[PDB]
Write a structure and sequence with these properties.
The structure is cut from a larger assembly and holds chains A (about 60 residues), B (about 250 residues), C (about 90 residues), D (about 110 residues) and E (about 120 residues).
Chain C: H1 4-14, H2 24-44, H3 49-72, H4 74-84
Helix pairs in contact in C: 1-2, 2-3, 3-4
Chain D: E1 2-10, H1 18-31, E2 35-45, E3 57-66, H2 68-80, E4 84-92, H3 101-105
Antiparallel strand pairs in D: 1-3, 1-4, 2-3
Chain E: E1 8-11, E2 19-23, E3 29-34, H1 48-60, E4 69-74, H2 83-89, E5 94-100
Parallel strand pairs in E: 1-4, 4-5
Antiparallel strand pairs in E: 1-2, 2-3
Chain E binds one RNA strand of 250 nucleotides through strand 2 and strand 3.
Subcellular location (chain B): Cytoplasm
Organism (chain B): Escherichia coli (strain K12 / MC4100 / BW2952)
Function (chain B): Specifically dimethylates two adjacent adenosines (A1518 and A1519) in the loop of a conserved hairpin near the 3'-end of 16S rRNA in the 30S particle. May play a critical role in biogenesis of 30S subunits.
Chain lengths: ~60, ~250, ~90, ~110, ~120
RNA sequence: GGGGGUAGAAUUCCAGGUGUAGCGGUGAAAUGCGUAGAGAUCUGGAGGAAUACCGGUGGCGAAGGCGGCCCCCUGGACGAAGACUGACGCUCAGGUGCGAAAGCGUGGGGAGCAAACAGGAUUACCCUGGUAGUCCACGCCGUAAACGAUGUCGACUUGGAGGUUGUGCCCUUGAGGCGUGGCUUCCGGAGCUAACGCGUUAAGUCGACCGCCUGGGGAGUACGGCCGCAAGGUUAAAACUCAAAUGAAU
């Protein structure tokens, strides 16, 4: 799952697309049922990938 | 909405005694209302000139039981007209008083200070917060624009305090009576009064900083040193006479 | 914080051997090392109070250890404060 | 002496002059005893939003062990160079050598 | 004075008015109508009825070019958000897409003093 | 915690396009903006302040407090196994330091908001502009319902539901079983309490040291000292006056 048994890479777009909504926001942990620690890692990875233009900030076009 | 008239009889004896209205003086008591303040005028004045903004009150005010034909009634707003017109009609400065809504009691005296001589003395009852500022002096926290402007025209003397429980639906504030009577001569005359207002407003708009930059939008340090004004004191430390000094200078020079 | 090599060198110098790491002399030396290093950091970042609060703890602990050493043995105390430049 | 991970992307039009950049940077890193544990080129990749009127870019990933000075030098050259549009260096706990999932999927 | 086969409907559904503007791919406007410029005033100016009246008026104002298809962009939370698209497709228009465009800041400037009511 | 870079949304302004007559605001209007083309919609730039989603009843800090991403310098807490010193401890009057917001001094900056001020209305509150200020560097000020209204340290005394963060052992698809630590939220037993309530994170049972209280008003006021550029802070009475003032529950 999201909690890979090691760490969460920020170069894995295929996995990171599971935890974002259509608009590109991050899905809260209530819906996914993921641990808090790995949720924090998720947020950091998604933000980093957003900086490098590997994911959309919102939906400009 | 509801106003709160004066009911207690013990308090309104001092007011009547303090005014001491005799015969031969022009009394212009605005807003009689229920005549709560003119009924204790039963020593009478053989005449009085009354001003009432409401026709309904004026209509059901022309007869009373005894009032009838002693007074002339005007139905225009006091803030609008020329008091001095009714000054050569009789020939003497008018003696007036009122119990107006504190709300509207401020603009009238500044509409009355212009007409000067047509006015001899005044006895109004105002809020305690405001009365203290009027009679205040420098180096306090009750010192302000109102004090300087009023003290430039007339003399301010408190007359009577009204504890809050004297009026029906009594408020949360205390009222007071002050006696003001315009000066016979100006201790410090100023060519243009509006420039004096300009200076005082600008100085007291930054009441908490030094005048080197509070009032430095118009002046310079060496100029204020010329007139002997310390450039490192707050606006509340400047005496009225000093405030008339740069009032004169700003017109004498450019 | 101190590097592991610097800590090991100080321990080897002041200690009885390579495992006596809890003697008063070694502790005072380690604290002095840290203090001397941190003046350089605080010369540049003077507006950083939250770490100056730990530097003060270092200084106070060193003073308490020195007083205990004074009362226990005097000659060792004199030799130590001469060896480290403490108290002029 | 620390481990880093540098990722930078370059103008698609200058996608042919990257070898010189890579060679220069490799020489600079290795000159000061630093090692290189992983070096990858993803080629041209389509951008996810228009970075100042462009689309697509040439992507470079490179894992390094090195001291602070060479990294500051690399940062300064990136800042002063023009063909590079966006770069990012990260510190990492320890060395890695396994290829990115990105290369394998391609 | 020119035939186009695509169009964009923009509505500004504020809390005090509504404005509908028709434009092309490049964003060059064709015709516009306002709820308050259709003989409405006062609270009546914010009612959905004025919105549909302005929608019809603007539709009639853009048939000289022969528009047959467009999609709608909504910008605002106010009333009149939905009546306009209905009155528009009732005037010979096909709705390809419906989009919400109202901006949201990521904590930008500070907002005014809210209604102490 | 200190320093330096950088990104994307939004508001305002500027310059360009398409376009024609209203926009904004209110309970209704007016001041106001516009035919020198507004408002609307698309393209480019300038500048300042703040970091949506994640976000939690979650985490860190002595308290005040701390929120985009990356690097450099740096303080504390916790856990595993082993080694070392040998009472090196606890508390602390005077003293020293840190300390929201507002406010001040010298010099910058100024997009949004907005005391004062300038206008327009209605019978308070409302609407349109808008200065100080909010921001930065360096000094001052030293106060808050600065609150858990609960001083710091140590030991002992039945339980039940949750959250967050380490670690040992077995077989091992392990979110599989048996343990062992730290911090934190809610119920409730004995006991305590005027009651409300607290209840192993005590307001229970004890020991060490410190601060403070003595009917209500006058009064945290006056006079004096110390501190401050100023505003003011701190230490701190009496004459007189009343027979009450107060807390919890019914």
């Amino acid at each position: 799952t999201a909690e890979g048994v090691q760490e969460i890479d920020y170069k894995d777009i295929a996995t990171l697309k599971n935890y974002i909504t259509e608009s590109g926001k991050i899905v809260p942990s209530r819906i996914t049922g993921t641990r808090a620690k790995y949720q924090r890692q998720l947020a950091r990875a998604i933000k980093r990938a957003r900086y490098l233009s590997l994911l959309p900030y919102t939906d400009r076009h | 909405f509801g106003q709160n008239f004066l009911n207690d009889q013990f308090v309104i004896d001092s007011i009547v005694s303090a005014i001491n209205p005799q015969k031969g003086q022009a009394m212009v008591e605005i807003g009689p209302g229920l005549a709560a303040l003119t009924e204790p005028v039963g020593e009478r004045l053989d005449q009085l000139t009354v001003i009432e903004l409401d026709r309904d009150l004026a209509a059901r005010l022309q007869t009373h039981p005894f009032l009838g034909p002693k007074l002339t009634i005007y139905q225009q707003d006091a803030m609008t007209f020329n008091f001095g017109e009714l000054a050569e009609k009789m020939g003497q400065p008018l003696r007036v008083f009122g119990n107006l809504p504190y709300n509207i009691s401020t603009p009238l005296m500044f509409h009355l200070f212009s007409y000067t001589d047509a006015i001899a003395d005044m006895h109004f009852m105002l809020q305690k917060e405001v009365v203290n500022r009027l009679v205040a002096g420098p180096n306090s926290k009750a010192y302000g624009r109102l004090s300087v402007m009023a003290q430039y025209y007339c003399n301010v003397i408190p007359v009577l305090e009204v504890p809050p429980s004297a009026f029906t639906p009594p408020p949360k504030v205390d009222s007071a009576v002050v006696r003001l009577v315009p000066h016979a001569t100006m201790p410090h005359p100023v060519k243009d009064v509006r420039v004096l207002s300009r200076i005082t407003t600008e100085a007291f708009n930054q009441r908490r900083k030094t005048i080197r930059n509070s009032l430095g939008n118009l002046f310079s340090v060496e100029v204020l040193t010329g007139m002997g004004i310390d450039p490192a004191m707050r606006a509340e430390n400047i005496s009225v006479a000093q405030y008339c000094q740069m009032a004169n200078y700003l017109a004498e020079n450019a | 914080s101190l590097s592991t090599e610097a800590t090991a060198k100080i321990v080897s110098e002041f200690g009885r051997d390579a495992n006596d790491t809890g003697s008063t002399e070694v502790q005072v030396a380690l604290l002095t090392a840290q203090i001397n290093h941190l003046q350089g950091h605080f010369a540049e970042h003077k507006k950083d109070h939250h770490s100056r609060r730990g530097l003060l703890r270092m200084v106070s602990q060193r003073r308490k250890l020195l007083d205990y050493l004074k009362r226990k043995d005097v000659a060792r105390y004199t030799q130590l404060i001469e060896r480290l430049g403490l108290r002029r | 002496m620390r481990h880093y991970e540098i990722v930078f992307m370059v103008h698609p039009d200058q996608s042919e002059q990257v070898p010189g950049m890579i060679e220069r940077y490799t020489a600079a890193i290795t000159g000061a005893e630093g090692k290189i544990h992983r070096l990858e080129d993803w080629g041209r990749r389509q951008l996810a939003y228009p970075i100042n009127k462009l689309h697509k870019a040439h992507y470079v990933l490179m894992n390094v062990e090195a001291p602070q000075e060479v990294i500051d030098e690399l940062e300064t050259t990136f800042r002063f160079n023009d063909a590079v549009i966006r770069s990012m260096v990260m510190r990492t706990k320890h060395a890695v050598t396994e290829a990115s999932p990105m290369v394998k999927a391609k | 004075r020119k035939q186009v086969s695509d169009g964009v409907a923009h509505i500004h559904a504020s809390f005090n008015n509504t404005i509908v503007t028709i434009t092309d791919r490049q964003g060059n406007a064709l015709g516009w109508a306002t709820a308050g410029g259709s003989g409405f005033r006062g609270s009546r100016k914010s009612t959905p009825f004025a919105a549909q009246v302005a929608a019809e008026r603007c539709a009639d104002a853009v048939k000289e070019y022969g528009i047959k298809n467009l999609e709608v962009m909504v910008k605002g939370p106010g009333p009149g958000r939905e009546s306009t698209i209905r009155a528009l497709n009732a005037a010979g228009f096909r709705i390809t897409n419906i989009t919400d465009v109202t901006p949201i800041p990521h904590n930008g400037c500070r907002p005014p003093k809210k209604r102490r009511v």
